[PDB]
Design a protein around this nucleic acid. Structure first.
Ligand SMILES: [Zn+2]
Lengths: 145, 107, 302, 98, 245
DNA sequence: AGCACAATTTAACACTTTTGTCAAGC
DNA sequence: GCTTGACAAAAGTGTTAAATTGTGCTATACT
């Protein structure tokens, strides 16, 4: 925009990370070995990151500049400048939570203070070496006692 | 080996000129995922609109219209029961179910 | 290190002997059969007496318990077998996990009536799963299994050949040897090599990397980018000097303005003429352009 | 004696690059940037930093202007700043320009 | 036995739960009180902890941002893959880290389906955690993942740190175009505002300008012919170069 | 390893229609 | 300027065979 005043940093909530992507990758494949073209749903994929050839889909039903902004109904690859593979991000939906390391294995461990746990006691918890109590129902533990 | 070794990219570059007028007409569809999401997708004007779309969300979504053509052809995944049925006859299993049963019934 | 925590955790489990798994398999199958009968009771309804249902549900729970017990008892065998597939393509823990999947498969496909040691039959699966893994998830650019088979076969053949001959064999040599043509063996050799990392410093001091010495062979020359627009404009100017029709005729023929060519009859479709009435005009216009005056300004862009 | 108007550029890093039959491009170091700043010449410094080293969309857009005889487009914010944001967001850092 | 009364867990899900049942204003008030009354090595710890507690409390942040549930993936052209002549592929190292992450994630996702002893699922989740840690910052916890040659792979953080990161980029200087160099001599007849310049170097630096300025005067049919004429060093150019310099 | 089999994609060939061509004429 | 006629090379179009790729499996015992 050519008009800056500041540059603010902040943590990215899990609800944003999935609001930047253009698709989720689910195959650790980069490119076919014989035809040298990005695989489907894997890294380098053309449907979630962009076209590899300027104004050309994956299958090839749209080739020239006359088809911009439209999406091939077969390979779902939008047709536009191949320079968009340098601005689009994807995401991965983890099967189980995972803690950012910049905040646990630092000094001082940010969680160690946010939760008041000894770092060598938090590492045991987040690396599946010991259990941790997460809630206790004092009401019943009082009466049913 | 520090030298000038020339490689090549994967893709292509065209010196064509961007133009925002006189381009093919398009038509927008509105698919919707399973967890109530709204996703707008463009399509060529003369194009066969599909029935299901792998949406930006990451899960297949249906159209905005009411076609509902076919949720069929699924094949159940080979489970443990099928593998047991393979190498075993019902009778045996039945008999077994009885014997062990007695053990729990007789403690 | 977590390999040690995992070894510790697996150790705490108590091993099994000759006939214990003999009983565990029976319990497994009984639980499976009771689970299946569950659906039969659901359809036939008539929930049996409190105990008639409780005992069967307890036997089912016993099924899962025995299954988990056997899995835990054999985890150690899995690790022992997978601890000799390391150093090439995968991490120890990934091999252990693939072996665990193979062991789950084996336990699902085991029989207790044949009277064999469980490990004897489990080893086949625990080795096949690890091999299929190392084949699928060991290369950045994936290579199907059937190709990995031939790659490994050719690697071993070349190793043995260099061992016998005591020197580097030749492509044609193995091609004659491996019942294929030299071109096919050269292709397989090509597929063999793995991608080069683009990070390590280039063999010395020590800041420059392998990246700053790659000169693109298809780079975007600026002179050509500028020349293309001038070429379009010069084409437009030249074609503006012909007849009112011939310009659009040639355009629609070579698809300049719209972007898609047209057949001979297609263009005349809008000019009410046929193949010849279009082709004659197009040819004569081309002969016109070939005139020196027209080609003087365009000959250089070619 | 050396010189370079426009030659080949490295593929990984878009800075100029030369060899045997390639110009090579001169190196505008650090103390030179310090001197430029001491002069207060911001436009010259930015030009030496953006449309002469990396900004691929800038080099061609200035060469076209020069050859056509138009005005050199005023140096905006380079494209090497819309990559720092992505390299940050790859760490779950949400940086916004206010 | 007694389980119905409480709840326990392990790992990132347990920490996320703990953070969910976390009231920040109450903790801030408690730290205010502790620094109000206490003293010694009991108000220094209180004040330190309050530092980050207030950092979280003031702005519109949320501690939930410290536990990931969806991992972003950087564009492909920031981890390029280029084919060196001879059909030899060369790529970054982030590809292998992403591949490890995705493989272990898919393996855990499949293993959960079948259902298996807790002993395996926990090891799998630990492997996934270690994979993500090696992704975001290699070598922080444990021994760094290494590829062929027993060398550490460059993780995401290595795109910013060191003298190779983005931050230290524009500072270390960078070679530019429209530049040259040469040996110098004395020009005792020059004025204070002039300098000598070899006609060859002048004709190389000003190639675009002369290419244009010799098109108006019809010395070349088009810019391409002009470039060719200049690269051939025809006699016409030397007259234009003095007009453009 | 290696094999056995299924599902998918690529190629090969007949054939039919379209698209370009020339000769002639009006 | 303009059409008709015959006429041949090119492109679909559909079918069938080859190769290609993915998946399951192998039972002395081995922890
Ligand atoms: Zn397409």
């Amino acid at each position: 925009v050519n008009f800056f005043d500041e540059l603010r940093i902040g943590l990215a909530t899990a609800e944003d990370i999935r609001q930047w992507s253009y698709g989720e990758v689910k195959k650790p494949e980069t490119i076919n070995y014989r035809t040298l073209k990005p695989e489907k749903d894997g890294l380098f994929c053309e449907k979630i990151f962009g076209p590899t050839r300027d104004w050309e889909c994956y299958c090839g039903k749209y080739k020239r500049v006359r088809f911009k902004g439209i999406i091939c109904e077969r390979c779902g690859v939008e047709v536009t400048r191949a320079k968009v593979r340098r601005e689009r991000m994807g995401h991965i939906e983890l099967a189980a939570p995972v803690t950012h390391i910049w905040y646990f294995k630092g000094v001082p461990s940010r969680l160690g203070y946010l939760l008041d746990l000894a770092p060598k006691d938090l590492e045991k918890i987040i690396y599946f070496a010991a259990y941790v109590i997460t809630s206790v129902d004092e009401e019943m533990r009082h009466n049913e006692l | 080996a520090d030298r000038v070794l020339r490689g090549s990219r994967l893709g292509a570059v065209s010196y064509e000129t961007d133009r925002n007028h006189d381009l093919a007409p398009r038509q927008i569809a509105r698919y919707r995922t399973d967890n109530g999401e709204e996703f707008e997708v463009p399509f060529a004007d003369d194009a066969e609109i599909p029935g299901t779309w792998l949406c930006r969300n990451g899960m297949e979504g249906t159209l905005i219209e009411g076609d509902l053509p076919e949720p069929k052809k699924v094949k159940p995944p080979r489970t443990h029961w099928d593998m047991l049925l393979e190498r075993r006859s019902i009778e045996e299993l039945e008999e077994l179910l009885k014997e062990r049963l007695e053990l729990i019934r007789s403690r | 290190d977590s390999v040690r925590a995992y070894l510790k955790q697996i150790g705490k489990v108590a091993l099994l002997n000759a006939e214990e798994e003999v009983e565990l398999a029976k319990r497994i199958e009984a639980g499976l059969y009771a689970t299946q009968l569950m659906t039969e009771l659901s359809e036939r309804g008539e929930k049996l007496p409190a105990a008639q249902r409780r005992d069967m549900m307890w036997i089912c729970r016993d099924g899962d318990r025995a299954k988990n017990h056997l899995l835990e008892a054999n985890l150690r065998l899995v690790v022992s077998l997978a601890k000799r597939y390391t150093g090439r393509g995968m991490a120890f823990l990934d091999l252990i996990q693939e072996g665990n999947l193979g062991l789950i498969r084996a336990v699902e496909k085991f029989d207790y009536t044949k009277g064999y040691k469980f490990s004897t039959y489990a080893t086949w699966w625990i080795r096949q799963a690890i091999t299929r893994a190392m084949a699928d998830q060991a290369r950045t650019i994936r290579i199907p299994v059937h190709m990995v088979e031939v790659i490994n076969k050719l690697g071993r053949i070349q190793r043995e050949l260099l061992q016998d001959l005591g020197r580097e064999p030749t492509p044609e040599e193995l091609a004659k040897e491996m019942d294929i043509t030299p071109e096919k063996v050269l292709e397989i050799q090509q597929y063999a090599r793995e991608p080069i990392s683009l990070d390590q410093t280039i063999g010395d001091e020590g800041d420059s990397q392998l990246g700053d010495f790659i000169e693109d062979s298809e780079a975007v020359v600026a002179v050509d980018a500028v020349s293309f627009t001038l070429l379009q404009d010069q084409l437009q100017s030249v074609l503006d000097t012909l007849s009112e029709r011939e310009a659009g005729v040639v355009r629609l023929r070579f698809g300049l303005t719209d972007g898609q060519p047209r057949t001979l009859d297609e263009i005349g479709q809008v000019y009410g003429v046929t193949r010849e009435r279009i082709r004659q005009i197009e040819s004569k216009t081309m002969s016109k352009l070939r005139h020196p005056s027209r080609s003087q300004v365009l000959r250089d862009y070619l | 004696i050396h010189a370079r108007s426009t030659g080949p550029y490295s593929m990984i890093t878009q800075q100029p690059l030369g060899g045997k039959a390639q110009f090579g491009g001169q190196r505008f170091g650090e103390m030179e940037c310090w001197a430029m700043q001491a002069y207060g010449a911001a436009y010259t410094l930015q030009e030496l930093l953006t449309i002469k080293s990396d900004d691929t969309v800038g080099r061609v857009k200035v060469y076209e202007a020069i050859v056509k005889g138009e005005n050199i487009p005023e140096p905006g914010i380079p494209e090497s700043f819309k990559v720092l944001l992505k390299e940050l967001q790859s760490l779950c850092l949400n940086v916004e320009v206010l | 036995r007694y389980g119905e009364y409480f709840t326990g867990a392990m790992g990132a899900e347990s920490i996320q739960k703990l953070i969910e049942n976390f009231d920040i204003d109450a903790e801030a008030e408690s730290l205010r009180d502790v620094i109000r009354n206490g003293k010694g090595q009991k108000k220094l710890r209180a004040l330190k902890r309050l530092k980050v507690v207030a950092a979280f409390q003031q702005s519109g942040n949320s501690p939930m941002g410290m536990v990931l549930d969806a991992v972003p993936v950087i564009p492909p052209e920031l981890r390029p893959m280029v084919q060196l002549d001879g059909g030899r592929f060369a790529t970054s190292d982030l590809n292998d880290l992403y591949r490890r992450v995705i493989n272990r994630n898919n393996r855990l996702k499949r293993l959960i389906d079948l259902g298996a002893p807790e002993i395996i699922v926990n090891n799998e989740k630990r492997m996934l955690q270690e994979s993500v840690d090696a992704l975001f910052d290699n070598g922080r916890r444990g021994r760094p993942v290494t590829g062929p040659g027993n060398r550490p792979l460059k993780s995401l953080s290595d795109l910013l740190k060191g003298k190779q990161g983005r931050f230290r980029q524009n500072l270390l200087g960078k070679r530019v175009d429209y530049s040259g160099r040469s040996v110098i001599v004395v020009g005792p007849q020059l004025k204070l505002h002039q300098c000598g310049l070899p006609k060859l170097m002048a004709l190389e630096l000003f190639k675009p300008f002369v290419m244009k300025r010799l098109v108006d005067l019809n010395h070349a049919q088009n810019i391409k012919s002009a470039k060719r004429m200049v690269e051939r060093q025809r006699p016409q150019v030397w007259d234009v170069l003095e007009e453009v310099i």
